[PDB]
Write a protein that binds this ligand. Sequence first.
Ligand SMILES: *[C@@H]1O[C@H](CO)[C@@H](O)[C@H](O)[C@H]1NC(C)=O
Ligand SMILES: *[C@@H]1O[C@H](CO)[C@@H](O)[C@H](O)[C@H]1NC(C)=O
Length: 233
Amino acid sequence: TTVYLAGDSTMAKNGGGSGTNGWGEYLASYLSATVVNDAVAGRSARSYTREGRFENIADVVTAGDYVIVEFGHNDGGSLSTDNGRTDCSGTGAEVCYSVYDGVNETILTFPAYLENAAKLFTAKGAKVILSSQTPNNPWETGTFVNSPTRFVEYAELAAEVAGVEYVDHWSYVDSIYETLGNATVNSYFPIDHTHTSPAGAEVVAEAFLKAVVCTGTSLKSVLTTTSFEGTCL
Ligand SMILES: *[C@@H]1O[C@H](CO)[C@@H](O)[C@H](O)[C@H]1NC(C)=O
Ligand SMILES: *[C@@H]1O[C@H](CO)[C@@H](O)[C@H](O)[C@H]1NC(C)=O
């Protein structure tokens, strides 16, 4: 069995560079399946879709395989000065137009991008798991602040609509981030408040596996152990 990872710099190998790393790099050792980390730094649901990265996964995925999709960090911004990643506002069939890189592009909503990808993978017999984005350093201000982005809910909404599984990666990460405290968590974010140090990337990975176990996600079948930190919910 093979597990494919689609995400951004918080999941990708080498994370955001400069000694940071993505959480996808710490799954292999707890799974009895091959893990392919196709996350790329700086990608949004739109950017990733347009670059044909979802297709590359669809071409190679075989029945029974797993696909984990997690975006959000790069999905915001303004289309006035299109950065190529910003999705169209809304949660449904909304459609935005914008000239990016010399092409009048048809831009969809965040849920729409995830839903289309989910359907594409389901069609190939693969098991799809949409995951909410990881949180930016909540202990950045010296005090713990829990303020999810709109993309956390949008991911849950996309899963329902597409009829696939959802894992609240956000909540499980923030949960232990709160337990770990100011000093510890802040060391996970050397450079900025998004890109985690290798030590932090591991914790974020553990958080995901804790969510899988607690919610009963199908991926638990290939878990080599169920002894992870924190408590359920
Ligand atoms: C892009 O296409 C839409 C609909 O086809 C059109 O209304 C819009 O004006 C186009 N954008 C530009 C900059 O031409
Ligand atoms: C939190 O930790 C940072 C970095 O370790 C430190 O500089 C800061 O003073 C701490 N803030 C509080 C309120 O404890």
